[PDB]
Amino acid sequence: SIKIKNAVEIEKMRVAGRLAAEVLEMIEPHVKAGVTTEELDQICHKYITEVQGAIPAPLNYHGFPKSICTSINHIVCHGIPASEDTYFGQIQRPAVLRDGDILNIDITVIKDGYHGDTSKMFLIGDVSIEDKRLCHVAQECLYLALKQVKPGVQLGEIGTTIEKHIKTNNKNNPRFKFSIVRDYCGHGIGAEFHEEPQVVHYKNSDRTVLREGMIFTIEPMINAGKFGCRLDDEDSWTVYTADGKKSAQWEHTILVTATGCEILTLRSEESLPRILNNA
């Protein structure tokens, strides 16, 4: 059952989404070669708890051992902040940022019982053209999906729009060909982290109709190689590309408006409007 938020819930979700964006704005100057993901987790936990008077959701309700998810390079999602690089058998489980890395920081804040969920890519020092393209095309996927959202649109149009963009990029850029992760989806979000509906990022024909007052996440994960992932059996959380190529993701929490959508997690650096009129 999908929740339609009332005026009061929308204003609390607006506050939680602004707070989630603010964490990502605050952390940026700390993100550089030689910093551990553990340090970023400490800086974010202190800011969320002591400055924002909010809660980091992963730590408190999801059984996650830390306050933020930090996914580097071939990590797709749910990277665990740590003070040292470890190994999942022969697979690197990184925690220390190096020149050339891409980094996803995923933030989920609760403020007065409502969730704000968002993530972005950081480019660490001199990043390859390949890796810049991957991060840039992943954000184009999110932006283009957002431009399809308005009351009356079927949910399947989101993944169809993302897969159309990736098929177009693959036709026009066969040196930089990408795939869409199938294992993880966007979701209704509000008083509860995981609400209806599920939002897949690949071509599908889900007939669920978007309505004004629905709030959900769009969070496409784009792989530089094949679509498949592998779960870390040792730490229960770290998701790797099955082929060891890099993966990039961007996430926004969005409110369906009368004529389009509101990006509740929009950041100050983004050249996307806070409110899209898609009618």
Ligand-binding annotation for 38, yes or no, is no
Ligand-binding annotation for 62, yes or no, is no
Residue 9 CB, nearest approach to Na ion (Å): 33
Residue 142 CB, nearest approach to Ni ion (Å): 12
Among Na ion, Ni ion, none, residue 247 binds (CB under 5-8 Å by kind): Na ion
Structure-token pair, residue 225: 């190689």
Q: Cβ of 3: how many Cβ atoms within 10 Å?
A: 17
Which of 22, 41, 101, 117 touches Ni ion by CB under 5 A? 117
Q: Does 106 bind Ni ion (CB under 5 A)?
A: yes
Ligand-binding annotation for 25, yes or no, is no
Among Ni ion, Na ion, none, residue 117 binds (CB under 5-8 Å by kind): Ni ion
Interface characters, 50-89, with Na ion (x: CB under 5 A): ---------------------x---x--------------
Ligand-binding annotation for 270, yes or no, is no
**Cα–Cα distance, 185 to 200 (Å, whole number):** 5
Residue 110 CB, nearest approach to Ni ion (Å): 13
Interface characters, 207-226, with Ni ion (x: CB under 5 A): ----------x---------
**Cα–Cα distance, 159 to 21 (Å, whole number):** 24
Interface characters, 235-254, with Na ion (x: CB under 5 A): ------------x-------
Q: Which residues are annotated as a binding site for substrate?
A: 78, 194
Residues that bind Ni ion (CB under 5 A): 106, 117, 217, 251
Residues that bind Na ion (CB under 5 A): 71, 75, 247
Q: Which residues are annotated as a binding site?
A: 78, 106, 117, 187, 194, 219, 251
